[PDB]
Design an enzyme around this catalytic site. Sequence first.
Site, mmCIF file in Angstrom:
data_model
loop_
_atom_site.group_PDB
_atom_site.id
_atom_site.type_symbol
_atom_site.label_atom_id
_atom_site.label_comp_id
_atom_site.label_asym_id
_atom_site.label_seq_id
_atom_site.Cartn_x
_atom_site.Cartn_y
_atom_site.Cartn_z
ATOM 1 C CG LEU A 1 -2.366 -0.734 1.108
ATOM 2 C CD1 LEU A 1 -3.061 -0.109 -0.234
ATOM 3 C CD2 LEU A 1 -2.463 -2.164 0.974
ATOM 4 C CG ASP A 2 2.455 4.423 -3.227
ATOM 5 O OD1 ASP A 2 3.546 4.821 -2.669
ATOM 6 O OD2 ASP A 2 2.305 5.054 -4.406
ATOM 7 C CB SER A 3 3.767 7.017 0.705
ATOM 8 O OG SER A 3 3.803 7.677 -0.644
ATOM 9 C CD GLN B 1 0.703 5.202 6.140
ATOM 10 O OE1 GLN B 1 1.257 3.937 6.051
ATOM 11 N NE2 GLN B 1 0.297 5.334 7.579
#
Lengths: 114, 156, 80, 208, 292
Positions: free
Chosen positions: C38-40, C43
């Site tokens: 799960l990408d920033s 995030q």
Amino acid sequence: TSVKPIFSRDMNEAKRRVRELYRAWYREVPNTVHLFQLDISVKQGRDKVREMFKKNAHVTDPRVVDLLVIKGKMELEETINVWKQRTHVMRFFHETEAPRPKDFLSKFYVGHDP
Amino acid sequence: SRGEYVVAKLDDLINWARRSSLWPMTFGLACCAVEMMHMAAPRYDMDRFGVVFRASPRQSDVMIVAGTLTNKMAPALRKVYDQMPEPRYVVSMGSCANGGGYYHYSYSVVRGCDRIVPVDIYVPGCPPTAEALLYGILQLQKKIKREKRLRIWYRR
Amino acid sequence: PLTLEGIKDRVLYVLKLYDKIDPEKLSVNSHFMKDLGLDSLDQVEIIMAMEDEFGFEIPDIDAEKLMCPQEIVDYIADKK
Amino acid sequence: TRPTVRPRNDVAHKQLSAFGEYVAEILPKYVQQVQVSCFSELEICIHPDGVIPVLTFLRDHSNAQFKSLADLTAVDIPTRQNRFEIVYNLLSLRFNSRIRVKTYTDELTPVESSVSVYKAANWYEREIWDMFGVFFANHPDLRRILTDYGFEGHPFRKDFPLSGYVELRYDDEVKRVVAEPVELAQEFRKFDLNSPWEAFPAYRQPPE
Amino acid sequence: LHHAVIPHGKGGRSSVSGIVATVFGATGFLGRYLVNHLGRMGSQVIVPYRCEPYDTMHLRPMGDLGQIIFMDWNGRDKDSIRRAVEHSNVVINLVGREWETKNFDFEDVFVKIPQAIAQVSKEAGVEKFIHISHLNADIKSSSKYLRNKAVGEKEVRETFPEATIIKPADIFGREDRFLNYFANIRSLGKKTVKQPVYIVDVTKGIINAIKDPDARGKTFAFVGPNRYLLFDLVQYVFAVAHRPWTTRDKVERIHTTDRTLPHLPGLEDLGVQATPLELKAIEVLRRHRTYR
Ligand SMILES: NC(=O)C1=CN([C@@H]2O[C@H](COP(=O)(O)OP(=O)(O)OC[C@H]3O[C@@H](n4cnc5c(N)ncnc54)[C@H](OP(=O)(O)O)[C@@H]3O)[C@@H](O)[C@H]2O)C=CC1
Ligand code: SF4
């Protein structure tokens, strides 16, 4: 090339300012899509927002990342005001096709194209 | 043919009542607006023909697009145009408006106002003369003379 | 009443209510930046989603430094 | 000669040469070039780190009022390390004299936005931000002026072509105005007009 | 194919495509949006009209510089129809008034009009003549509308048999008729299953049928994937609207049915994505006073 900075001294404040921009765009969608009387779900507009952030993955220099944050902040000003309109937001969407192809076979029949 | 004779009489009546006045709106972007103001001159009247300035768009009969349409202006142009009494006509006044003219290239110019609205009566010039503008309004009135609206409606 | 249990359970159902959690796959040792893919972007979506639901203002450095549901539970159980 | 040739001035040329030499001496920190052409209007050419100091010194010091501003333009030139040229152009009220204040810059390094000493330059600075890209630090509002909202590109560059990348028309499918890639109806037949045979022999740079 | 009929360049706004379209009808709804997509495609549209020129001025800003062209005809003559189909690459037939005028019945419009125009179309040597038809146009009773369209299907299959007959279901759009009558209220309880289809997927299927061969002879159908009941659709349209010259052939149509036919291919076999009715219904469910 000891260039003057813009906002950030390294990539840390660059990532912090662009994630603050994306925070503002996430909390910026529902007010505008309820106000401007559009035809599109909130999730689809938020997905085009995150898609437009996904377009710029190759951007490296801190001047350029800060300048993208400046453009995004200017556009968020012009969309938190109603200086812009429904035409511009539907121009961010690309709905009226234009289904223009990418296959070499379809670049060949419908041709004179690379 | 008493029915079609009555239809012809009443259609001629309502078409005459249409072609009488034709009060426009004072849209007037650029110096074709100044030419409109000199069509409001004593030496060339418009109130001889009931062409009366009525600034609110929801009661103007025609729309005289005059001045250089731009891309920043064009949504305002059509969102004025789309709310109007149900008969509506467009007089495109000037070489800027009716095919771009001198700025036909050069970004944020719509290449003539044909790309935005339906345009009935063209009057070309930079500027058009006021005499030519009044001739365009007279030929608009002759377009009103050949409507045959209720004749088409009855023989439908 | 605002101990670890109600906070972790409400984080649990709002992460279940989150859209692109693929799959649900919740853990107190999750670390979904380099363990769950799960990408920033996602995030910061999660962090200010918690802010929008029931949290504090969550300033940007502390909005950056959660990374995992354990630190989310700990910080909201800390300040509240 | 005596008719049909515009006569040059002498004493005004002398005074502007003296005044340019005066400024160039009394500011050793920000001076690269001072020059006077034939029609006697002073030119100063400046490194971009003393812009507000030079404009404060050229607003006051009481032997140079220069209270009227003009044009700011960062006139685009390729081939250089520094493309963009900020061109101030100042007129004095007690003096009847004209100076040009040309400082140079590149595509990304900002300058200090001299709106705080000349309030006239506010909309000028916003406009040249919209058309070029010379970013202005310590400035209140950078919006877009003389452009469309959804349009970008800073279109007065030599990279942005004459016709745009955008076109607007109307459709009734979604009842609104949409954009398209551009479709000209005529070629814009460009006219080759570069004459041979040494148009001006006095301006011959040293050949490579 | 003649020179300057060959396609050129990127699409739209002087892209002289391989079609030269001749459209009948188009003063109304579906043909106007079809001319809208043709001007998006950038071909020359020959369209006639017998009406007041307002709607043809209304569709003037669609094509490029001097592309579309207008003429006249009536349901009496042959010369004007022949003049329309003098030099036409593709030709389509939309026609039909949903109520009886004093001289055009439901009879003899679908009988007399597609016969003459399709016959002179075959006598002009055209390719891919397309004719519309409603879904479940049966010889079975309680539908003058559907039985006359079935007679029209029979005539078009008789003369020039390899014409493209297109049958969609009911069409929801921007200026819909039956959904306007759904909105046209102010006590009745009935039921009949029904599923509609959206107008722009219909016309994308139309242009794919008009420029993609292997399509002739066999008729095509265009139905949205809904497949639910009239009562749920009335609840849906009044929950979105937020409210608590017409004949009863309208109410016969909306209480008939919507059944399927597996003999003929549809949307995905022809290759255009089907959109459901949700946000387009949100579009076409305006006029309400202060809930927006
Ligand atoms: N879902 C479906 O499959 C359905 C399909 N249809 C068909 O699709 C088309 C569009 O539908 P709809 O909205 O109902 O109708 P429209 O109003 O859009 O189109 C009907 C057209 O027929 C023309 N016309 C009819 N009778 C005559 C005549 N005697 N002389 C000249 N022109 C005539 C009308 O011209 P004018 O207005 O100028 O008089 C108009 O252009 C029609 O052809 C219709 O049969 C209709 C309903 C449902
Ligand atoms: S056509 Fe000429 S007179 Fe009219 S607005 Fe354009 S420039 Fe002015």
